[PDB]
Predict the structure of o-glcnacase BT_4395.
Amino acid sequence: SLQPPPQQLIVQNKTIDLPAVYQLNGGEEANPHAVKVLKELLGMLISIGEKGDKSVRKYSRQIPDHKEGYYLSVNEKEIVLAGNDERGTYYALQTFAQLLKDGKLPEVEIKDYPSVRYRGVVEGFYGTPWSHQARLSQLKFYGKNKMNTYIYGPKDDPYHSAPNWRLPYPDKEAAQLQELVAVANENEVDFVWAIHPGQDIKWNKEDRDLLLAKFEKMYQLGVRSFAVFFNDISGEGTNPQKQAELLNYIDEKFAQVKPDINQLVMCPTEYNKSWSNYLTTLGDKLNPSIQIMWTGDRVISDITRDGISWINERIKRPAYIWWNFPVSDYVRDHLLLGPVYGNDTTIAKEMSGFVTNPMEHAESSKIAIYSVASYAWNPAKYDTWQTWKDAIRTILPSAAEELECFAMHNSDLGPNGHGYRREESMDIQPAAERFLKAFKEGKNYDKADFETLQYTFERMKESADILLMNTENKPLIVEITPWVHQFKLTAEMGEEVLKMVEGNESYFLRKYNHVKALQQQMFYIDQTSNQNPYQPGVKTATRVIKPLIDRTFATVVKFFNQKFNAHLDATT
Ligand SMILES: CC1=[NH+][C@H]2[C@@H](O1)O[C@H](CO)[C@@H](O)[C@@H]2O
Ligand SMILES: [Ca+2]
């Protein structure tokens, strides 16, 4: 199992021992970051190097001729880790580290390279920006999954957006950015520093000079890739001719002047199909090397063949995709922990880049991020479900089943202004649907369904309790804890409500009162946890499980009230 899966893989059904004695050719000429991964993992010859190095001369026809490509070979006689370029060598090592299992390797031959040129993450959501420690952890994770791109653009950073985009970062923060940049470098990730000036930009010399001075300060802190964001603004900063002129100016006086600038990227104001001469003005005027970002047919959407042709026709270049999932900044009471799916797997050539805007919950986003990394590297082989399982097992190996259970009932967004939904709880959804119907109509429910609902609530309780106490990824557990409490409460409510379904008039009373107490505890968590100004609270298992419970409760309470002439409160 390899994530992302390589372009080409031939496996020989033999295994070799990681050599106790070995001879390393190329250690001094190969990418230092790749050599470092190799030595920590470690007579038999091992050859490491970039094409052009004396170490790998014998394999140069083996090395794929692609940016970031690599040839990797393991057999009983030798090991070869040969990049087409320095980052390709590092990528060989990240594949190599996954082959190693118990001091053993399979005999293989891999030729690999990314299908999409830029792959990664844009921290571009509304809400609490990622902590410094969060970001350090992200960048290690990106290099492991061959994501080469991190776009730094937290809407609420005042040195990124209006009005202090004009001011150098204060010393403390600048030292932090500088560390991020060094750590990105170590993990072969391009730190792309974004600026968001359009809300108060003046199309004059004063503001244009300030923007270049700011980019120059960022250059001094090590930054080598840059973006200019014009998303979600109003006023004169939306002018497409002015924007293109600015980006072209930046390109002419900065990106073409410095020896080593990599990505120059812009996010347009009209960044999705439903929100549109703006696009053709940019496509025609903006220098061809400059990237243009795009979220799809709507603010939140998945990328289709027709959707991507539509945009590429207007911008006159392959669109650099900003995918708004798992971003939850418009449904902040939900965690979106489901599979990444819905994106067309045959359009790699029609995109310059593919990044995912994640949740404010950094560790919880690694499930989707790991999947996006898999998809963007090798879309033709992208496997939604398997990759979601591999993500979870990679992130929490000590409690993989429990995180799966929690994530599979924490996927949908609930009703929202963007109209964007995800599947959730599909496993039990038939059994749920059948159970509910047998009440609506007044018939006997199938027993197997009752038990499947029991088993589901039980596994939910187990997973909640185990996740709470897990110490392998504490930051993850801190992020999800309030939803964990609420998820456990849901499961307990579920067990008690089913017990109410199985008839004693005094037993039913105990169980009803118990359920009233559980509802109250859930109200309390919803009223005191995650109290943001927009979608306060904590909602979990909303698509299928919570309605199933609430409906079943309202039904059985009604039957009871009709039977014993009582007036129990049937609300939820
Ligand atoms: C390009 C773009 N910018 C906005 C918009 O898409 O919607 C996102 C999700 O609500 C939000 O996070 C982002 O800041
Ligand atoms: Ca070299």
